[PDB]
Design a protein around this ligand. Structure first.
Ligand SMILES: *[C@@H]1O[C@H](CO)[C@@H](O[C@@H]2O[C@H](CO)[C@@H](O)[C@H](O)[C@H]2NC(C)=O)[C@H](O)[C@H]1NC(C)=O
Ligand SMILES: *[C@@H]1O[C@H](CO)[C@@H](O)[C@H](O)[C@H]1NC(C)=O
Ligand SMILES: *[C@@H]1O[C@H](CO)[C@@H](O)[C@H](O)[C@H]1NC(C)=O
Ligand SMILES: *[C@@H]1O[C@H](CO)[C@@H](O)[C@H](O)[C@H]1NC(C)=O
Lengths: 66, 49, 49, 49, 196, 49
C-alpha cells in the first residue's frame, strides 16, 4: 500500500501466480511524501523513477572580452 | 551498480581476446553480492538493496 | 612555355590497403609541332608498406 | 628504460654489463603488437620493432 | 480513398514547448479545371502561429497541380494539441487560367483536424530510487521523500513506482539453455562440469 | 537497368527528386575502426517528373 499525504492512496497485491508480474503506477504530486506499507509474507522489489526538466539559468553578464 | 577492473588497465594492454586478463567482472561482482548476502543471524535490508 | 607542370592528386581512388599492389607512374609528354610522344616509367616501387 | 628522439632521432643508450651469457635488446615506440585491428586476415598495417 | 481536392499537412510526431518550428501545409488538385485556393488554419490559444507567405494570394493549381505554404508556430500547452486546417475553392477569378467553375460537393471545403504531441521544454533528466521490502510473516514500512524542484518547470515532474519479484526476468533462458555433455581434459572437464 | 517509381495516395504519381545509390559492398578496406566497409557506390540524381 502506497499512502501519500495529499489523499493519494494506492494498493497492490502480489501472489505466486503474478509472481513475476510488474505492477507499475504513476505518481502525480510534485511534492513527494510517499509512505510504503507492506504486509504478509514474501519479498517485493520496489523501483521508483522520477523525471523532470531543467536548465532555465546560466545566462549571466561577465567580462568575457566581448 | 557494479565494479570493473581499474577502469582500463594502466600499463600497455589489450589488442583483444582478453589476453592474460579474462575481465572477471561478472565473477567479482557476484563475489561482492555473495559477500553482502552473508551474515550470521540473517542479512539486513541495505545489503539486500 | 616557361617552367614545368605540377599536379596534386588524391590517393582515395587507390585504396592503399591489403589487396591493391604497387604504384607505376607512366608519364607521357607530347611535344608540339611534331606530334612526338615519349613515355617514362617511374616510381613503380613506391613502398606502400 | 625510456628515452626520446632528438633533432636527429638518435639515442645513445648505455647499459652496464655484469650479467648472463647472452643479452637480448629491443626498442619500441608503440607496444609489441599492431595495436589497431591486427587480427582479421584482411589487414594491412605494421610497426617495426 | 481519395478526394478530388485535398489539403495535407506535414510536421513531426513530437515537438518542444520552447523552441519554434514550421508546419508545412500542402494542397493537391486532381480535377482538370484549374482553380485558385484559399488555404488557412484555425489555431487555438494553446500555441502561436505566424504565416510566411500570407500576403501573396495563391494563383491556381490545375490537374495534378499542388501548392504549399508554411507557418512558423511555437507551442504553449503540453501533450496532444489539435490543429485545424481549412482549404476551399473560389469562383470568378479568371486571372490564372481560362476558366474556374469551382463547384465541389456540399463538403467543398476540406476541414482537417490533426493532433500533434509536445513535450515539456528544458533538458529532460531523471532520478531513481529503489528498495527491497521483505515482510517475513509480519509488517514492514518505508518512507520515500521525492523533492527536487531546483530551477525546474511546473508539470514536468512525473514519478512512478513499480512493484515486482525479479529473480525470473532471466531465470528462463540460461537454466534451460545450459546442461551439456562432459568431455575433454581436466580443465575442460571442469569447465563443462561445474556449471551444471 | 535501373528504375525508380514512387507510389502515393491511391498510387498516383508524385513529383520530386530522387537519389539512387547503387552499390557494391565489402571492399578491400580492412573494415575496422578506420576503414569503411562500404565498397564502390554510384549516386545518380533524377528529377521525378
Ligand atoms: C481535440 O483532440 C481530441 C483527441 O485528442 C478530440 O477528442 C475526441 O473528441 C470526440 C468528439 O468530438 C470524442 O468522441 C472522442 O472520444 C475524442 N477522442 C477520443 C480518441 O476519444 C477533440 O475532438 C479535438 N477537439 C477538441 C475541441 O478538443
Ligand atoms: C619513462 O621514464 C622517464 C624518466 O626517465 C619518465 O619521465 C617518463 O614519463 C617515462 N615514460 C612514460 C611513458 O611516462
Ligand atoms: C654499472 O652498474 C653496475 C650495477 O651493479 C655497477 O656495479 C657498476 O659499478 C656500474 N658501473 C659504472 C657506473 O661505471
Ligand atoms: C534496359 O533498358 C533498355 C532501354 O533503356 C531496353 O532496351 C532493355 O530491353 C532493358 N533491359 C535489359 C537491357 O535487360
Amino acid at each position: 500500500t502506497i499512502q501519500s499525504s495529499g489523499t493519494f492512496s494506492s494498493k497492490f497485491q502480489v501472489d505466486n501466480n503474478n509472481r513475476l508480474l510488474l505492477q507499475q503506477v504513476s505518481l502525480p504530486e510534485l511534492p513527494g511524501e510517499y509512505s510504503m506499507k507492506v504486509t504478509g509474507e514474501g519479498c517485493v522489489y520496489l523501483q521508483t523513477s522520477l523525471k523532470y526538466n531543467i536548465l532555465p539559468e546560466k545566462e549571466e553578464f561577465p567580462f568575457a572580452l566581448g | 551498480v557494479h565494479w570493473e577492473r581499474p577502469q582500463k588497465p594502466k600499463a600497455p594492454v589489450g589488442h583483444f581476446y582478453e589476453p592474460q586478463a579474462p575481465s572477471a567482472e561478472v565473477e567479482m561482482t557476484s563475489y561482492v553480492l555473495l559477500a553482502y548476502l552473508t551474515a550470521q543471524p540473517a542479512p539486513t535490508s541495505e545489503d539486500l538493496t | 612555355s616557361h617552367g614545368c607542370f605540377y599536379q596534386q592528386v588524391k590517393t582515395k581512388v587507390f585504396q592503399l590497403k591489403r589487396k591493391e599492389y604497387e604504384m607505376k607512374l607512366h608519364t607521357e609528354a607530347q611535344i608540339q609541332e611534331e606530334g612526338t610522344v615519349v613515355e617514362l616509367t617511374g616510381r613503380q616501387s613506391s613502398e606502400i608498406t | 628504460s625510456n628515452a626520446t628522439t632528438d633533432e636527429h632521432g638518435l639515442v645513445q643508450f648505455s647499459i652496464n654489463t655484469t650479467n648472463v651469457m647472452g643479452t637480448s635488446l629491443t626498442v619500441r615506440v608503440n607496444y609489441k603488437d599492431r595495436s589497431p585491428c591486427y587480427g582479421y586476415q584482411w589487414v594491412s598495417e605494421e610497426h617495426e620493432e | 480513398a481519395f478526394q478530388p481536392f485535398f489539403v495535407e499537412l506535414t510536421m513531426p510526431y513530437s515537438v518542444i514547448r520552447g523552441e519554434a518550428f514550421t508546419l508545412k501545409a500542402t494542397v493537391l488538385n486532381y480535377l482538370p479545371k484549374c482553380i485558385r485556393v484559399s488555404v488557412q488554419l484555425e489555431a487555438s490559444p494553446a500555441f502561436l502561429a505566424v504565416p510566411v507567405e500570407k500576403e501573396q494570394a495563391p494563383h491556381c493549381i490545375c490537374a495534378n497541380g499542388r501548392q504549399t505554404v508554411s507557418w512558423a508556430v511555437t507551442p504553449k500547452s503540453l501533450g496532444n494539441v489539435n490543429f485545424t486546417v481549412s482549404a476551399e475553392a473560389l469562383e470568378s477569378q479568371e486571372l490564372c487560367g481560362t476558366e474556374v467553375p469551382s463547384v465541389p460537393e456540399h463538403g467543398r471545403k476540406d476541414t482537417v483536424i490533426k493532433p500533434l504531441l509536445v513535450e515539456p521544454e528544458g533538458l529532460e533528466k531523471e532520478t531513481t530510487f529503489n528498495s527491497l521490502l521483505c515482510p517475513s510473516g509480519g509488517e514492514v514500512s518505508e518512507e520515500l521523500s521525492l523533492k527536487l524542484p531546483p530551477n525546474v518547470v511546473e508539470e514536468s515532474a512525473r514519478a512512478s513506482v513499480s512493484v515486482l519479484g525479479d529473480i525470473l526476468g532471466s531465470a528462463m533462458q540460461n537454466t534451460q539453455n545450459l546442461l551439456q555433455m562432459p568431455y575433454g581434459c581436466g580443465e575442460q572437464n571442469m569447465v563443462l562440469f561445474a556449471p551444471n | 537497368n535501373v528504375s525508380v517509381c514512387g507510389l502515393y495516395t491511391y498510387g498516383k504519381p508524385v513529383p520530386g527528386h530522387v537519389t539512387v545509390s547503387i552499390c557494391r559492398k565489402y571492399s578491400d578496406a580492412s573494415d575496422c575502426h578506420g576503414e569503411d566497409s562500404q565498397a564502390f557506390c554510384e549516386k545518380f540524381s533524377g528529377q521525378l517528373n
